[PDB]
Design a protein around this ligand. Structure first.
Ligand SMILES: *[C@@H]1O[C@H](CO)[C@@H](O)[C@H](O)[C@H]1NC(C)=O
Ligand SMILES: *[C@@H]1O[C@H](CO)[C@@H](O)[C@H](O)[C@H]1NC(C)=O
Lengths: 52, 49
């Protein structure tokens, strides 16, 4: 698209359509006030007793 | 006129099933003993409260 009679740095643009899921790290903003859940993954490597 | 919202809470660690300490109240103890007896030229053993 072309917008006539307009200067750079008077507008804002972003990419909005995504098809994949991302971990909700505290370093990224929330998508909406109340977030929706899509799935979960497990943490490997449990503890066990051994000898030294 | 921007704002930011933050929150947190506290939970219990998963590792508590293996690494923990416990407190007890103590009461009167029981006692037992083990003896050796030389009798009729042979060794026998007994155990009793
Ligand atoms: C061994 O692990 C179990 C749980 O998996 C725990 O209850 C127990 O106290 C452990 N024993 C030792 C000696 O670490
Ligand atoms: C068992 O009896 C023998 C005698 O038959 C004795 O010499 C020995 O000392 C006794 N055992 C113990 C541990 O005292």
């Amino acid at each position: 698209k072309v917008i006539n009679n307009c200067k750079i740095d008077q507008c804002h643009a972003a990419v909005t359509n995504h098809k994949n899921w991302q971990y909700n790290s505290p370093l990224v903003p929330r998508n909406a006030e109340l977030g929706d859940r899509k799935g979960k993954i497990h943490i490997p490597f449990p503890l066990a007793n051994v000898t030294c | 006129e921007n704002t930011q919202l933050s929150e947190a809470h506290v939970e219990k660690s998963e590792s508590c099933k293996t690494e923990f300490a416990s407190a007890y109240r103590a009461h009167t103890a029981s006692a037992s003993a083990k003896l050796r007896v030389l009798y009729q030229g042979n060794n026998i053993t007994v155990a009793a409260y």
